[PDB]
Design a protein around this ligand. Structure first.
Ligand SMILES: OCCNC(=S)N[C@H]1C[C@@H]2C=C[C@H]1C2
Length: 209
């Protein structure tokens, strides 16, 4: 059972701007997704202080970076708080509407795309490098879901039947054909050191077989 939804017009506009604007400094997508993962980890860690059972779905708080040249995917996995179905369809998009508007006005006043994270919508910088993004997520209070969008104004949500996650979020970047440098170990290492050196959780960069 796959459900198809229309993006809010403002988010579709943000996605088109990210996809169509000429802007060479694409590597910042990784900082924005790692920052999102760090925030999700902060949330479950804080909530576990008053309800330790919230970690029954997994004690480890970490971030894994998994490149796969065969599938041409870069996967960012965290064991954070995860997202509910309502998060995927309604809640986060509602919040992102005001952040998108502020970001759009800032860009017109001279900001650049690298400052997208200051407006809370850094996730969508994934489309600087990905033609399709798949998000697998599991929140303690809900089922495991797959969100997916290739832009163009629509996204899908389905119950995920694959390997159970325990808790957290997996962002699968199906990279554009000319963006495969983000599958190279030395390139990912360089970006993490430059932009994500002080993240307060272990970041493991997987090596390819
Ligand atoms: O996870 C926090 C960042 N997410 C944002 S800003 N927006 C939503 C769009 C995609 C589906 C749910 C999330 C990712």
């Amino acid at each position: 059972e796959v459900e198809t939804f229309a993006f809010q017009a403002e988010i579709a506009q943000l996605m088109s701007l990210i996809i169509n604007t000429f802007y060479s400094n694409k590597e910042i997508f990784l900082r924005e997704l790692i920052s999102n993962s760090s925030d999700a980890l902060d949330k479950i860690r804080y909530e576990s202080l008053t309800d330790p059972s919230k970690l029954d779905s997994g004690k480890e708080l970490h971030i894994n970076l998994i490149p796969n040249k065969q599938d041409r995917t870069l996967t960012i996995v965290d064991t954070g708080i995860g997202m509910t179905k309502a998060d995927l369809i309604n809640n986060l998009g509602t919040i992102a509407k005001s952040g998108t508007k502020a970001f759009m006005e800032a860009l017109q006043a001279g900001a650049d795309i690298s400052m997208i994270g200051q407006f809370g919508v850094g996730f969508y910088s994934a489309y600087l490098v990905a033609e399709k993004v798949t998000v697998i997520t599991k929140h303690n209070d809900d089922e495991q879901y797959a969100w997916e969008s290739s832009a163009g104004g629509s996204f899908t949500v389905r119950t995920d039947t694959g390997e159970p996650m325990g808790r957290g979020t997996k962002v699968i970047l199906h990279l554009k054909e000319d963006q495969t440098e983000y599958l190279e170990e030395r390139r990912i290492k360089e970006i993490v050191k430059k932009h994500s050196q002080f993240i307060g959780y272990p970041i493991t960069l997987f090596v390819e077989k």
